[PDB]
C-alpha cells in the first residue's frame, strides 16, 4: 500500500554527498535562506530518484512514498539525544538537510508556533518520564493513529520521516479509508460537519521550553480545545475521500448519537485494517497525511544512547493556503 524506491550505491553516494555540501554551505535547515534554496537544490539530486518521486506524488491509490538505502554511520552520528531541545547534534546534521532535500520534491516545508519551540526539523524519540504520553517521545504507550495536526485546516499534506537508528526494529503504523466495509449511511454522515477534533497534547505549553510558554499562540490552541467547531472526518470524493480524525483526540458534535455511532464504527474499522511499516536506519518515508492516518507501535525504551531516533518535517502543498495562521514568520504556524 506504499511507493517504495531503493537507491543504488551511486545514487545514495550522490544524494549524501550533496546534503554534506548543504551543511557546509548554510548555517541551518530552519534559516530562511536554506528553505527558499532547498527545492532548487534537491534538483540536483539523481534523476532516477526525481523521476520516482514525480510520479509517486502523481498516483492516486499509495498511502506512502518511501526510499530505502541512504546510509547512516552510528558512529560519526553519536549517541541518541535525551530531549528533542538538544537533538540536534554535528551527527545528524547533514542527515537533517538529506531529509529537507528529499521534502523540497514533494512541497513546502513548514512548523507550529506551539511544537517544539517552533522548530521546522523535528525529532521523534523517546523521552524518559514521558513513556505513556499521547505524543511522539512516547515509547512503552503506543502512539495512537492519527492525522498529523487534525484540529488544523492548515495541517500538512505529507509527513516526512528519516530514520537515523531505529535497532531494535520499531513499526510506524498506518491505515486507509476503511472503504470496503463503511456503509453508505455511516460514509454519509462522516461527510457531515457533525465531529469535534481537538488539539493534540504536543502543542501543550507543558511540551514546549519554558522560555516559549508565554507565546500568544497557545491561545489559539486552547481555544481550539475549549470550543472546536464541527468538521466532517472524510472530504471529496466517495470512491477516495481524504480522512481527517485523530483516535485520541475527536469526538461526535455535542448529543449527536449517528455522528457518535459513525466515528466508533470508523475506529474499529481503522484499528481492524491497520498495518506496519519498518523505518530501518536510513529509510525515508512520506506518508500521504489526506489518505491515511499513522501511529507507532509500543517498545521498551533503552535509555543507553542508542534509542530509535527519527528526524520528522511537515510538507505543504501551498503554504499560501495558511496565511491567516502565519505567526510573524510563513513557515511557523499560529493564531491568537
Ligand atoms: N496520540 C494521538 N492519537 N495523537 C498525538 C499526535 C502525535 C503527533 O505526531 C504529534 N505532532 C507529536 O509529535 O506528538
Ligand atoms: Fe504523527
Redesign the pocket.
Known sequence: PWSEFRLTPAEAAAAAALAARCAQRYDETDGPEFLLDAPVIAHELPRRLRTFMARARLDAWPHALVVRGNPVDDAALGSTPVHWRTARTPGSRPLSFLLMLYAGLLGDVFGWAT?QDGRVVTD?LPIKGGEHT???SSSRQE????T??AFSPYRADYVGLLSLRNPDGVATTLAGVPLDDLDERTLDVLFQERFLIRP???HLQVNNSTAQQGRVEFEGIAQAADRPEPVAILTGHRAAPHLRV????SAPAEGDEEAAAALGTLRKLIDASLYELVLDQGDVAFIDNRRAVHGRRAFQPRYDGRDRWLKRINITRDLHRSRKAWAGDSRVLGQR
Not at 143 to 146: A, E, R, S, Y
Not at 246 to 249: A, K, S
Open positions: 511544537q521523534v499521547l505524543v511522539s502512539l495512537g493513529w492519527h498529523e495536526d493534540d497534547d504536543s485523530d483516535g485520541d483526540f
